[PDB]
Amino acid sequence: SNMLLNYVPVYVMLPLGVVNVDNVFEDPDGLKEQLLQLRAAGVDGVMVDVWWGIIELKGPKQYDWRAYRSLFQLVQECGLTLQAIMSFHQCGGNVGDIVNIPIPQWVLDIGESNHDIFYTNRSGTRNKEYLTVGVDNEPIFHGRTAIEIYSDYMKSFRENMSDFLESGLIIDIEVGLGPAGELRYPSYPQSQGWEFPRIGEFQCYDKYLKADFKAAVARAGHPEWELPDDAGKYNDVPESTGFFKSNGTYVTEKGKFFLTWYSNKLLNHGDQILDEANKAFLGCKVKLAIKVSGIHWWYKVENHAAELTAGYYNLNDRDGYRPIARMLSRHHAILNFTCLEMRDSEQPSDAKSGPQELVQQVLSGGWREDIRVAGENALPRYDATAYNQIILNAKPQGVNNNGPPKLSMFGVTYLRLSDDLLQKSNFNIFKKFVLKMHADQDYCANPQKYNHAITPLKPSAPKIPIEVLLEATKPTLPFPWLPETDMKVDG
Numbered sequence: 001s002n003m004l005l006n007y008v009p010v011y012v013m014l015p016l017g018v019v020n021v022d023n024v025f026e027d028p029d030g031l032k033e034q035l036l037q038l039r040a041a042g043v044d045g046v047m048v049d050v051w052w053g054i055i056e057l058k059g060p061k062q063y064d065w066r067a068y069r070s071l072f073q074l075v076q077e078c079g080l081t082l083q084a085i086m087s088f089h090q091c092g093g094n095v096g097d098i099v100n101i102p103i104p105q106w107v108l109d110i111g112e113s114n115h116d117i118f119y120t121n122r123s124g125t126r127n128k129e130y131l132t133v134g135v136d137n138e139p140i141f142h143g144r145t146a147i148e149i150y151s152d153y154m155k156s157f158r159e160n161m162s163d164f165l166e167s168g169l170i171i172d173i174e175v176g177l178g179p180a181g182e183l184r185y186p187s188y189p190q191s192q193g194w195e196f197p198r199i200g201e202f203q204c205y206d207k208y209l210k211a212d213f214k215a216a217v218a219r220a221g222h223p224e225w226e227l228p229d230d231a232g233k234y235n236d237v238p239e240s241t242g243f244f245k246s247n248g249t250y251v252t253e254k255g256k257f258f259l260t261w262y263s264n265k266l267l268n269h270g271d272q273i274l275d276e277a278n279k280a281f282l283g284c285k286v287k288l289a290i291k292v293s294g295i296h297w298w299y300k301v302e303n304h305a306a307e308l309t310a311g312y313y314n315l316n317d318r319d320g321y322r323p324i325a326r327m328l329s330r331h332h333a334i335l336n337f338t339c340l341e342m343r344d345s346e347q348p349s350d351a352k353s354g355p356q357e358l359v360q361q362v363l364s365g366g367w368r369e370d371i372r373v374a375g376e377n378a379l380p381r382y383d384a385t386a387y388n389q390i391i392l393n394a395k396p397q398g399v400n401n402n403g404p405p406k407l408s409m410f411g412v413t414y415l416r417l418s419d420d421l422l423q424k425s426n427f428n429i430f431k432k433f434v435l436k437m438h439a440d441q442d443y444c445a446n447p448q449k450y451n452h453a454i455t456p457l458k459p460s461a462p463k464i465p466i467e468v469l470l471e472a473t474k475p476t477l478p479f480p481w482l483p484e485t486d487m488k489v490d491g
């Protein structure tokens, strides 16, 4: 017993591009001042993208870890821990983007002659942010499969960073699984014109995923079934489409077959690469983590359109998040849910948005499957009402004065370190959010004091067959949330 058993750690994402496209850590001195500000405020650690496109730029297995070694060196000197993201995706690239980091140019050159390695919508547009799950086991990248590329990157990371791993700097390894490092399809690409609150588009039209679907429907006894031709366009509203309207194609046997195939592609993608990540970090004192997106728009209508096009097959009578938490339990991994601050009342009504009940459904699913749940805010916020919503989600039933809370999140990573955060009046409110996350205790350098000790990563438990995974689609009632935190930052 102790209020310290109530402590939930706070981490801060580092600036995008802190080491740049040229693999140079540009300004150790500037980062250093900022990192020391963060250490004085009581922040437990930081999070950084380890961009595949910077490190394996020159060619297959041509890795240069030097600028990231210097960055981890400086973080360790500032007394902070680190969450490392194995970022196999593109950063930025659209209008007025601050940073643009693509994937390896050598992979991009293969895609010049085989455009089907990228995610593709019905119109034939290639999204180059991430390699389609269709080429995961295709040996077409100079003799390697895309999962062997990801596996090798993680093994080289473990060998060349083993002194930071052995010294306990790195708290967890987040492994990037899609666009923006999240396990999902690129269904809402800003770059292709999408604008909130639109339903997005299915991204299964590359030749590998289409050839896969057609063989599957032929085996289910319906060889004549096709991919959606009536789901509309990025910016539609669902009732405007044949697929998502009342009694439309999604409710059909053909539509339910497609939606089960499409969302299952992500579960097996997630499970095979995390199989690799557990081999690469076996024995290290690190926890594995993945990022799931919070797609709250259209959550309040029956068709949950934006979630379905993203690959999350979540309906009111079908839980599409607790199969992901179940799959994560054999790898002993954490579910990092990337949206934690929004309130429904902040949403335009015509978006039919349910941020607060999407969170209660995803975190209750994880704690029910007995995994650890972490999260991030989705958009930069500096105000107390955002911060008080993060703290309510961090500990849904308040502080337990008498022991550990029944329910608590494993960590929260705040989106971005910026000069704005550090502005004097903003930083004084961030300091109080850190205090309340810590349940009013000072920062605690030793995690074991607050029951966060990290053990050497055990080997993955056995494969869970997809029929036992999909049993977790049975809808359950969420655990109860307090209406408001008992540890307010105070407006």
Ligand SMILES: OC[C@H]1O[C@@H]2O[C@H]3[C@H](O)[C@@H](O)[C@@H](O[C@H]4[C@H](O)[C@@H](O)[C@@H](O[C@H]5[C@H](O)[C@@H](O)[C@@H](O[C@H]6[C@H](O)[C@@H](O)[C@@H](O[C@H]7[C@H](O)[C@@H](O)[C@@H](O[C@H]1[C@H](O)[C@H]2O)O[C@@H]7CO)O[C@@H]6CO)O[C@@H]5CO)O[C@@H]4CO)O[C@@H]3CO
Residues within 6 Å of the ligand: 195, 196, 294, 338, 339, 377, 378, 379, 380, 415
């Ligand atoms: O590069 C863009 C953006 O990318 C990443 O954000 C994700 C986000 O994490 C996802 O959840 C999703 O976001 C949805 C929201 O969930 C949804 O509510 C809606 O958001 C509206 C906001 O609610 C509304 O306030 C307003 O947003 C403002 C915003 O408050 C401003 O701060 C400013 O936003 C910029 C950010 O400040 C900047 O960091 C960057 O954001 C990244 C983000 O860091 C990253 O996590 O760019 C944005 C855009 O300029 O301006 C906006 C208004 O322009 O309006 C939005 C709707 O326009 O919609 C978003 C998606 O639009 O998806 C994003 C994108 O992948």
